[PDB]
Amino acid sequence: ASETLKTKKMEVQIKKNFPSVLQYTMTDGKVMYGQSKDVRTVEINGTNIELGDDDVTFKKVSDTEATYTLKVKDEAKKIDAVITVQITVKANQLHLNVTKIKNNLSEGIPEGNGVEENAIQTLSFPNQSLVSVRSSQENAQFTGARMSSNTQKPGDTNFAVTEDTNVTDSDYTYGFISGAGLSAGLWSNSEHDGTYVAAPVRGGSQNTRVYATTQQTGDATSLGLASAPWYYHRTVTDSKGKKYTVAETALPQMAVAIAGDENEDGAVNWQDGAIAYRDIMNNPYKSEEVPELVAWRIAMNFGSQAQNPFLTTLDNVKKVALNTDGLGQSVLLKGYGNEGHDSGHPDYGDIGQRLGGADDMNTMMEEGSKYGARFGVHVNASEMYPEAKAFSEDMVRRNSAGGLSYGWNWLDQGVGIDGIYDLASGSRVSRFADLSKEVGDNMDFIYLDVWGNLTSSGSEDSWETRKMSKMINDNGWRMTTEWGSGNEYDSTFQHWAADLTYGGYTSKGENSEVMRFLRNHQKDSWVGDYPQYGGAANAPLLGGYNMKDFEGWQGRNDYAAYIKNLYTHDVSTKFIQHFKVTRWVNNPLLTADNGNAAAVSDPNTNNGNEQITLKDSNGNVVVVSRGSNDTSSAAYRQRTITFNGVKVASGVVSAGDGSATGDESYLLPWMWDSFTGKLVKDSEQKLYHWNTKGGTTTWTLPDSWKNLSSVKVYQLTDQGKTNEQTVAVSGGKVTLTADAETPYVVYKGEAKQIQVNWSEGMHVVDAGFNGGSNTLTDNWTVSGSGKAEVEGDNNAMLRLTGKVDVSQRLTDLKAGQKYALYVGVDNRSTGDASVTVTSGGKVLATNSTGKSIAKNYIKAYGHNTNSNTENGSSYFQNMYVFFTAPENGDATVTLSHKSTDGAHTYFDDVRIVENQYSGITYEKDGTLKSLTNGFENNAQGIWPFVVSGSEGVEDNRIHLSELHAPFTRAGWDVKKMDDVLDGTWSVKVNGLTQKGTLVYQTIPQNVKFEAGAKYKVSFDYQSGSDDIYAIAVGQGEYSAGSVKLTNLKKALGETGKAEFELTGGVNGDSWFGIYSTATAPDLQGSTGNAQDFGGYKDFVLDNLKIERIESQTRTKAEAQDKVKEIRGKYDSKRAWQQYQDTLVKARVLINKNGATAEDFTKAYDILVALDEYMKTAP
């Protein structure tokens, strides 16, 4: 016997003896079958149990709901369960939910996720056939999807269901059946992993949730769909062999939705079922905001450098907002935590103190949201460093031998995290809670790096990935991840899908027509244009996110290229995501040969060439059409886009792989706000215009613009809307002239400038010189005979020439508190460039640099030596002052150039930060008396040192190491060096042996050594081997063979001491530093990772002390005699520039009117140093 459940759209006949459907009858009389045969199988823990009449009780709750109680028992196999099942119907949907599972053999999971004996681990209903179609029905067919990251291998299958179709639990991510005028897909929350087409990783790539099985049904073959098995209480083992039972992510759920000809195209196939399927499918959390995310990019910090503090990222948000006229953004903070990128894993709650900590991060996010910018952070749940407070013996993944599972060595040695322990112990969820306490509700997303690559365990399956995504989504965070194929269920972005350059054609986003038809609008997880990959990547009609960056990720810093790329691919891609696919025909990727014979070829659509139709909930219609399906035709890459029948884009996109400029032009109506994406005031609707080659094009305006007599057009730049033009509208059409690759925005009437207050929270207005030439009148005050300009078409800078002062009042200081102020400076002049903080005309603090001597090698930094500040190079380095905020609240910063030279000084990034450093002591006249540094208060970087060129422009393997005993100390595992010598922080060099060049160095702007003055330098150190690192002393820009070197002896696990004296060079440009020799390390018979983790190749420095010392006082005569002695030694040589230079300068000190004993002593000491130099001169 049976009962009927009923909605306005259908009646469903259900069996009383099992949660089975006999058939669905739609209002119009069309019928779809369920399970026409007596099948009553329940699987628990892999055992099939067939239920009899007495094993099932039934109750019809209402016309929309029935409840079943299933006794599921097999004594032999230790199964004794009672399963409650609910069937409900609404509209054209039927839901089947397991609402209760009672285990008669268990009291549940023991405390701390102990093993539950006889746990019900898996449950399914084999061959349940919730919906079915038959070989006897008209146009009976199946379409299924599996995961493919390979642009040349489609994930889909499309075939007719015939009497020969034979299939048993054939598994698919998605599965649709159609026949006799109806179509249905089956949805399930099953975490089952199964068959895939192509995927480089696990991590949820393999989730297959639908099982297709044929059975004989009278004289016909019936293809039925069932859910793949669900996990309930799964028992798992960690890397140490410890077992746990972990409760279900969610109770079992599944559903079907019955469609007729939903897109009204006269055929019934999976596309009709897919439209209905959107009403029942899981939707990734916060997938509704994806179409607003026009401007993705990464802002990077690394190696303690603070390349991108949070308030700077906010300013770059405002710059992008101006240049895009306020389109939404999604900024991925790679290195938001601890010392930067790939430091501090997995302490999710440790927000980078050198970046401004949680406070600046929150200010950035809160203010950024007003410009439609979302923020998210890069985390790692697979690898960790000793420095992280979460690092523990239980967190460590061990191999079967009991040794560490080592990760990557770079700044420090990474160690695998035991992924099963991290889940089952509650450790990972607790660290995400730490992060939640810091960010509250402000942060948009998590970016989970690497998950799926088997670094945390050999599984990382869909079950683990589902739990991972849930702990993230539970904190209000949208899920995003690295690998193109990963996390089909929950992820809304894959870095290796959106950045098309990575991985190659086998390793991209999801190459499936079914998946993209269903979810294009919900994810940036697809294949975009990158034609060298072929197939899916040759001009996809839907486009696809193409991600570039300008804030340091992999050295990327080209802002203009970033913006051009947004307009080339991303604006149209995002426009398209505002609509949902309703029809897709003539797909050239699908053939009879690749398992897709039943895909539609409609010769009456677009000449039988590919076309996709999309609609929104207001009935707007977008149609995207391929010029030709033949890849050797010029027309294969031609795309037309229409909006409500009107052409809004036409042509060939510049190749997404950078290889060939295109000719596409567009006039796209951007009808939505950058927030929840609602329609904007009819009066603030706008169109974006782009013309790849440049030139003149004519367009039909949207219907609501058709009666206007003119429009207003603005050219968009980094300053916002410029060059307003009034363009006549004639018969609803406009003609537009555009420079090539230049963005314009079109309004119905006059439009106001997006308001921007540069550098909120930064104590100064426009700290990064983003406000155009106007900033030097509106924000900064310029004075003097020289010249101040905002210079650079990329990351703009202050450029000074001649005698000029540029100043600005400081705001929002806490009176009586200590601050560092540092500014990037590159001085090409021989004259000094200075930074000064004054209060009431009185100097609080001041510092200066002569000609810069050290090029910038910091890859993630915006003015490194690959960025061309001037000539082939950049010498940008941070120049500091330290002051106490005055009680009267009156403080001013001045940036200046003194000399009347024609050469330039560059400044950028004025940073005022609370800072407790107080290790500099001056002499009466303001020269250096002493500088000490335990590195406990570094605002950023390895100050007073700067990183040198031993790795070129790199994410340099030098940073501030952090204490976390015992793991960071000698003696843990195979570690033989302490990371930290004193306090919590030291300067660490990792593995930079045999470079035969300078590793880092002081510079004059950081530590100035006065000409002829004498200084004692000392520090504590550890060094992994004898003579692998040396003290270097030099004057001016480093050059091979013009430095004094002193080899350092091994101090491995016990701290050594170094001290030496130096005499200031005559040009004030002396410096000392650490140098990597040509000597090989002694690895003490260590092999494998031990060679790196042992510390044999490393150098740690702490407790630096620099102090002026008393020199033996000299008379003028002694100095004069020393000149004679030196000239007697070397004037007869010549077998010399340095010599003559030092000599002239020494004689100046000697002969000056009013010279004193200090002058004579300096002259004498200068000549003694000249003597030592000259002994080993070229």
- Active centre residues (catalytic): 449, 482
Subset of residues 984 to 1003 that bind Mn ion, contact rule: CB under 5 A: 985
- Give the Cβ contact number of residue 731 at 10 Å: 7
Cβ proximity to Mn ion, 236 vs 981, nearer residue: 981
> What is the four-CA torsion angle of 261, 265, 270, 272, rounded to 10 degrees?
-40
The reply to whether 1102 sits near Mn ion by the rule CB under 5 A is yes
Cβ proximity to Mn ion, 116 vs 449, nearer residue: 449
Cβ proximity to Mn ion, 276 vs 1166, nearer residue: 276
Instruction: Name residue 6's beta-bridge partners.
Output: 11
The reply to whether 412 sits near Mn ion by the rule CB under 5 A is yes
The reply to whether 934 sits near Mn ion by the rule CB under 5 A is yes
Check the annotation: does 794 bind a ligand.
no
Phi, psi of 363 (to 5 degrees): -65, -45
Angstrom distance (rounded) from CA 432 to CA 378: 12
Check the annotation: does 484 bind a ligand.
no
The reply to whether 573 sits near Mn ion by the rule CB under 5 A is no
3-state secondary structure (DSSP) of residue 536: helix
Stretch of 24-32, 436-444, 590-598, 926-934 contacting Mn ion, by CB under 5 A: 926-934
The reply to whether 380 sits near Mn ion by the rule CB under 5 A is no
Cβ proximity to Mn ion, 611 vs 795, nearer residue: 795
The reply to whether 367 sits near Mn ion by the rule CB under 5 A is no
Residues 176 and 281: beta-carbon distance below 8 Å: no
Subset of residues 953 to 982 that bind Mn ion, contact rule: CB under 5 A: 961, 982
Stretch of 170-178, 406-414, 513-521, 1022-1030 contacting Mn ion, by CB under 5 A: 406-414
Check the annotation: does 412 bind a ligand.
yes
Please select the residue that binds Mn ion; options are 156, 272, 315, 1159, rule is CB under 5 A: 272
Check the annotation: does 387 bind a ligand.
yes
Alpha carbon 686 to chain centroid distance? Answer: 30
Check the annotation: does 908 bind a ligand.
yes
> What is the four-CA torsion angle of 15, 19, 23, 24, rounded to 10 degrees?
120
Check the annotation: does 936 bind a ligand.
yes
Cβ proximity to Mn ion, 272 vs 510, nearer residue: 272
The reply to whether 230 sits near Mn ion by the rule CB under 5 A is no
Stretch of 205-213, 379-387, 433-441, 729-737 contacting Mn ion, by CB under 5 A: 379-387
| Inter-axis angle of helices 310-324 and 357-369, nearest 10 | 10
Give, rounded to a whole angstrom, the gap between the first and last alpha carbons of the chain.
Answer: 105
Angstrom distance (rounded) from CA 1136 to CA 1157: 28
Stretch of 296-304, 771-779, 793-801, 923-931 contacting Mn ion, by CB under 5 A: 793-801
Residues 584 and 606: beta-carbon distance below 8 Å: no
Look up residue 54 and give its two tokens. Answer: 């007495």
Check the annotation: does 263 bind a ligand.
yes
Please select the residue that binds Mn ion; options are 935, 945, 1019, 1075, rule is CB under 5 A: 935
The reply to whether 952 sits near Mn ion by the rule CB under 5 A is no
The reply to whether 908 sits near Mn ion by the rule CB under 5 A is yes
Look up residue 766 and give its two tokens. Answer: 């426009």
The reply to whether 383 sits near Mn ion by the rule CB under 5 A is no
- Give the Cβ contact number of residue 407 at 10 Å: 22
Check the annotation: does 1102 bind a ligand.
yes
Stretch of 55-63, 255-263, 676-684, 836-844 contacting Mn ion, by CB under 5 A: 255-263
The reply to whether 315 sits near Mn ion by the rule CB under 5 A is no
Sheet of 445-448, strand order: 295-300, 329-334, 373-379, 445-448, 478-481
Residues across the chain: 1178
Check the annotation: does 959 bind a ligand.
yes
Check the annotation: does 265 bind a ligand.
yes
Subset of residues 88 to 147 that bind Mn ion, contact rule: CB under 5 A: none
Please select the residue that binds Mn ion; options are 795, 956, 968, 1142, rule is CB under 5 A: 795
The reply to whether 983 sits near Mn ion by the rule CB under 5 A is yes
What beta strand segments (E) does 718-812 contain? 720-728, 733-738, 744-747, 781-783, 787-791, 797-801, 804-809
Shortest separation between residue 922's beta carbon and Mn ion, angstroms:
23
- Contacts with Mn ion, 416-455, as mask; x by CB under 5 A: ----------------------------------------
Mode of pairing for the β-strands spanning 928-933 and 1099-1108: antiparallel
Could you tell me which of 890, 1002, 895 has the C-alpha nearest to residue 947? 1002
Mode of pairing for the β-strands spanning 182-188 and 804-809: unpaired
The kind and range of the H/E element at 561 are helix 559-565
Please select the residue that binds Mn ion; options are 3, 43, 74, 265, rule is CB under 5 A: 265
Please select the residue that binds Mn ion; options are 43, 261, 890, 1037, rule is CB under 5 A: 261
Residues 98 and 251: beta-carbon distance below 8 Å: yes
Give the per-residue SS3 of 42-60. EEECCEEEECCHHHEEEEE
Shortest separation between residue 979's beta carbon and Mn ion, angstroms:
7
Count of residues binding Mn ion (CB under 5 A)? Answer: 20
Stretch of 29-37, 260-268, 427-435, 638-646 contacting Mn ion, by CB under 5 A: 260-268
Angstrom distance (rounded) from CA 982 to CA 1102: 7
Please select the residue that binds Mn ion; options are 20, 127, 249, 263, rule is CB under 5 A: 263
Check the annotation: does 198 bind a ligand.
no
Give Cβ neighbours of residue 1061 (< 8 Å, ≥ 6 apart).
Answer: 1014, 1015, 1016, 1017, 1109
Check the annotation: does 915 bind a ligand.
no
The reply to whether 768 sits near Mn ion by the rule CB under 5 A is yes
Applying CB under 5 A, the residues found at the interface with Mn ion are 261, 263, 265, 267, 272, 387, 411-412, 768-769, 795-796, 908, 934-935, 961, 982-983, 985, 1102
Binding-site residues from annotation for Mn(2+) = 261, 263, 265, 267, 272, 387, 412, 768, 795-796, 908, 934, 936, 959, 982, 985, 1102
